[PDB]
């Protein structure tokens, strides 16, 4: 299962034996982001705006803690866009799924998020964020052509293109009327 | 008069070429942006394995 969340994300659970369980979108006290971890400190300090205390020395007894098997997991490239356009917690793969089945799963859905006359700049900015890891040269270009339609002047070019997009059916109609005149006017020159 | 008649002709040509280029620039952008999106969808995605040691920053 995948689900979209708000940035910044911070979760710190104090454990009973005196360690702390941390999952956080940003670094603090040398703890890496995005991967969770069990954290212990030798001297009281403030991390993620709260106090992580040094635990009381304990006596060792025979353990019964479980040790689960490790597991690599491959996710779809655009998992973030799939989770965002559902607005609920959604199933994205299985532990033991093939590359082919995994891909043919949100492909039709994703293809039909096509370019529109009404949010071309907002679309072009998604395409860049999607392309950045694949082709960084193209991303930087797309991002540029994004900010040109949005920012340059008062966004007048964005406006102009948006409007010329919505007019397409009228233009064809006129274009057709011109041909029907031109053909007649031409045929009415030949002897 | 001849200069004004010539100016009108030259203006119309540059005005025609101006549009026929804009038609070609917009057409090429729509083709390339839509293909890249298709390729973005089918790329291999990230891998996660819950290894902390791997993500250490010094």
């Amino acid at each position: 299962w995948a689900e979209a969340v708000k940035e910044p994300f911070v979760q710190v659970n104090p454990l009973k034996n005196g360690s702390y369980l941390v999952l956080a979108s940003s670094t603090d006290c040398q703890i890496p982001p995005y991967v969770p971890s069990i954290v212990t400190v030798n001297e009281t300090t403030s991390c993620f705006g709260l106090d992580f205390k040094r635990p009381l020395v304990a006596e060792e007894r025979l353990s019964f803690e479980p040790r689960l098997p490790n597991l690599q997991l491959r996710l779809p490239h655009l998992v973030g866009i799939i989770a965002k356009i559902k607005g609920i917690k959604i199933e994205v793969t299985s532990s033991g799924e093939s590359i082919k089945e995994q891909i043919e799963r949100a492909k039709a859905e994703l293809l039909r998020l096509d370019i529109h006359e009404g949010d071309t700049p907002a679309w072009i900015q998604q395409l860049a964020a999607a392309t950045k890891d694949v082709w960084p040269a193209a991303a930087s270009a797309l991002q540029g052509i994004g900010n040109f339609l949005s920012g340059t002047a008062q966004g007048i070019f964005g406006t102009a293109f948006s409007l010329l997009g919505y007019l397409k059916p009228i233009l064809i109609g006129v274009g057709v009327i011109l041909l029907v005149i031109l053909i007649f006017k031409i045929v009415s020159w030949i002897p | 008069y001849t200069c004004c008649a010539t100016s009108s002709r030259v203006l119309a040509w540059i005005f025609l070429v101006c549009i026929l280029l804009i038609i070609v620039l917009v057409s090429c952008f729509v083709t390339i942006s839509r293909i890249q999106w298709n390729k973005d969808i089918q790329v291999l995605g990230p891998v996660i394995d819950w290894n902390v040691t791997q993500r250490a920053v010094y």
């Binding site: 890496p32 969770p36 400190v41 030798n42 | 819950w50 902390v52």
Partner: peptide, 17 residues
């Protein structure tokens, strides 16, 4: 400004369980 350090140990959680 004097160098003072605190030790911080970290371990993994297979499968996130």
């Amino acid at each position: 400004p004097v160098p003072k350090y605190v030790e911080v140990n970290m371990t993994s959680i297979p499968q996130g369980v």
